[PDB]
Design a binder for this molecule. Structure first.
Ligand SMILES: [Cl-]
Ligand SMILES: [Cl-]
Lengths: 505, 506
């Protein structure tokens, strides 16, 4: 008898993980069991037994007989298909009155939502010999010492199951439409840093263990990306604060030659002389490279450092990646101005972006609300809003927000597909090249991109920030380049705002 | 590209784990690749391509064909079956000259021995997005931060394991599975004078190379799983009894049974042998002797004695989540049953540590399996393992008296452990035949012979080279012979082959 492992709860007290009593099928086959018995205490008719049990468990008659034919065995089991049986399965089998058949109670870890925030919650595995459960990934692993029992401590997360559903359904949709190699979405409270929802694909099912181990890495904290143009917002912020960005001032668009590489605006030719505000709305690489020059390379590196890049956010997830600011030569510096070369985690991106909606204060993202024992009522840990740094002034944040509004809402916008009928949205898109894992350079192909969007709503005074990213669509890659992650952002954001009771127009 | 992950080595420099180059199958299906080409550069005949590829990747032609038929796709990959392909698979596929088909180089973790010391070495898993490898169990996990080159080459971990001895253990355990199909099974070989783990394996287990069965049992039997050890535990009560003056080998004691707190506790043969000498009682693995010695020594002292032998506390090895076990001492029944290894739970590493005292003048040796952690480029040594005394619970004199009784257990005329003898070598040890606690609910597992059978042996007797401890829990086949022969069919080949390998005179 193990102590009961603590539960994992969402922010509203809904169970995400708990221990339950299930049942294991056992069949006595040795004749000795019926030696001194009135009625047989072993399986006498193997074919009839296999026929009846085949209706309850997920096994074909022939395989049941095969197992029942084990020689020199007193008792036999039926693998995982004979265990984790529900109480209804127990009654169903016991009503048959099959000689030698019985059900033994056994404890299992249950995830009521199945595949749901899987890479965050994780999975606990059971040692058959003792029944001991041990976390192998995510919260189950991180908090294993508290969760393990007396009775184990409960862990309460900031996740809201209602919002989590919107994310799971939207990611399922992106997989069917685009079959990408990697995909994630996260919803964060813009004013507190709480993670309200988080999912990724591909992922696993904690309940059944399907696909567990195929990808150990949690995308939010452990996987790294060349973020692309969502990263332009931090270069814009620096330039605003340094006095280098003036929205009405004209600048030369087109291309720049650097260390042998031809870096141009996404449309090749650029737009000639245009205002910097418009340059940002168009996601101009030349604008960012010029702003970098106006501010200075040394100062820009420090700017990205003050925005938390290249350092872990110090969250409670295990093995959080620090990423790295790519600044070794002018080519890395210049490509870093539009989010290539430099690598980041999604949690760093959320942390940095929060500065624009909190008077310049970055909020440390958090997903653990509480670790507490339900018997003693002792609270071992309580999460809270915490400032990660204040890299910019309130004035600078307001000016950045003005440009984010324009990105989506300008008459010359190239991100109109992120608009949600009845709501005001703002944000920044990214369309990045992806580094080939076996070195060399970038992944080749028709549209080999990591597409993403960092959005918030209602604009100016947001309730939530939604960050979604999709790496390397293997299907409909053209549409993925065209629409980015709009097909995930729109339903996630619209459903979330409604659930949070934000007025529609 | 990721830095190279460090290697895991056995004590002689043989590779147990390393990074290698393997290949991923890629198929171009879009017409565009052949727009300006004399020959096709995309898959033109999907049915034939699927037929020919099915000969290398373990995938049915209809499935390959289905995957090749995906709409709005440029390139097709084939999941796990299309990755980790060998250089030989690569040449075989390339020789087919299939339009649109190519092999991409990729890094994979390679375990040359396959299923071999699996629960000790562990397995590293690969994040396909970046290629980053991360340890998920065992040494791969414990030393992940050293092994990975990103926390630029990673550091190597050298173990005390000897692959030659390990082969003997893997073969013996395979034999026990075939014969008895037990629920759990382990064997460990330790250098009797240094505490170095020379070999270690368990069943069921997994294959680190393929990941087959990985996750079915997270627990390493040596450090994490706990057992009610049975009569192998009698040796520590004997040692305590000897040092306190309670054990006189010539002195007589009355055997049979004892009614403790309502329950009737008797010797394995039910009737006992009546009034007999103590020395003979230990040879017969008498429960009445141990219960009587507990009384002579006193309950408070015995608990303390088990504590000084390291029970109830982690040995402080480098394995993650080492279990402390516990001494069952809440009431007289638990106290008395602990005299013969029930109620009390232990790890096998604790058992090895305690047993080592009898062959090292009373000093327990802390078992160890990590020989060094060092970077092969800089030559920096981060850690170096060594022999360390875990405590000296007994005197040189007491250790010698215990060894005298262990000798008799196996070599006395009236021995019931003759099946553990090895022709040509002098062996000694103690047998165990314990009841096993049911995972859910109370009481012990039911059945005709629901036992955890074990043997803690050493050889050559008195001056042993190695200690071999093996245990088998709940045979599901030949449970009768499991009860009669214990783990003799594992101990004999493991010990005999190990002694020959270590050049011990026969
Ligand atoms: Cl947190
Ligand atoms: Cl060690």
């Amino acid at each position: 008898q193990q102590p009961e492992r603590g539960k994992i709860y969402d922010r509203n007290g809904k169970v995400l993980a708990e221990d339950v009593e299930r049942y294991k099928l056992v069949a006595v086959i040795d004749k000795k069991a019926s030696a001194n018995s009135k009625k047989p205490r072993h399986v006498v008719d193997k074919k009839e037994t296999a026929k009846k049990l085949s209706t309850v468990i997920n096994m074909k008659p022939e395989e049941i007989e095969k197992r029942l034919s084990q020689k020199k065995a007193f008792q036999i089991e039926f693998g995982r298909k004979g265990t984790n049986l529900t109480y209804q399965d127990k009654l169903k089998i016991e009503k048959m009155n099959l000689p030698g058949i019985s059900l033994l109670p056994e404890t299992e870890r249950f995830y009521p939502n199945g595949n749901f925030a899987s890479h965050l919650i994780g999975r606990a595995q059971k040692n058959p010999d003792t029944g001991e459960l041990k976390g192998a990934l995510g919260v189950e692993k991180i908090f294993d010492s508290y969760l393990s029992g007396k009775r184990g401590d409960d862990v309460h997360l900031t996740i809201d199951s209602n919002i989590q559903v919107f994310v799971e359904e939207a990611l399922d949709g992106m997989v069917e439409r685009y079959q990408p190699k990697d995909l994630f979405a996260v919803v964060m409270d813009a004013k507190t840093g709480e993670i309200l929802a988080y999912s990724q694909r591909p992922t696993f099912n904690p309940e059944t263990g399907k696909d567990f181990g195929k990808k150990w890495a949690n995308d939010l904290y452990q996987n790294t990306y060349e973020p692309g143009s969502t990263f332009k917002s931090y270069g814009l912020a620096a330039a605003i604060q340094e006095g280098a960005f003036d929205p009405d001032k004209k600048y030369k668009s087109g291309h720049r030659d650097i260390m042998g590489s031809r870096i141009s605006d996404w449309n090749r030719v650029g737009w000639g002389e245009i205002p910097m505000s418009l340059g940002f709305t168009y996601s101009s690489n030349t604008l960012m490279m010029h702003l970098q020059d106006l501010v200075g390379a040394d100062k820009m590196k420090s700017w990205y450092e003050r925005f938390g890049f290249g350092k872990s956010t110090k969250g409670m997830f295990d093995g959080e990646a620090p990423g790295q600011i790519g600044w070794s030569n002018e080519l890395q510096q210049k490509t870093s101005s539009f989010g290539q070369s430099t690598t980041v985690t999604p949690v760093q991106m959320l942390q940095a972006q929060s500065a624009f909606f909190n008077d310049g204060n970055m909020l440390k993202p958090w997903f653990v609300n509480s670790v507490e024992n339900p018997v003693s009522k002792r609270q071992f840990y309580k999460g809270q809003k915490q400032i990660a740094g204040k890299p910019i002034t309130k004035d600078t944040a307001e000016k950045v927000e003005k440009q984010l509004d324009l990105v989506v809402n300008s008459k010359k916008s190239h991100a109109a597909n992120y608009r949600i009928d009845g709501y005001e949205v703002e944000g920044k898109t990214g369309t990045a090249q992806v580094a080939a894992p076996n070195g060399g350079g970038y992944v080749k192909g028709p549209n080999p991109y990591f597409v993403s969007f960092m959005g918030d709503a209602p604009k100016k005074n947001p309730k939530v920030i939604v960050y979604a990213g999709m790496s390397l669509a293997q299907k409909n890659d053209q549409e993925a380049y065209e629409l980015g992650v709009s097909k995930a952002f729109k339903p996630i954001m619209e459903n979330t705002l409604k659930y949070l009771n934000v007025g529609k127009s």
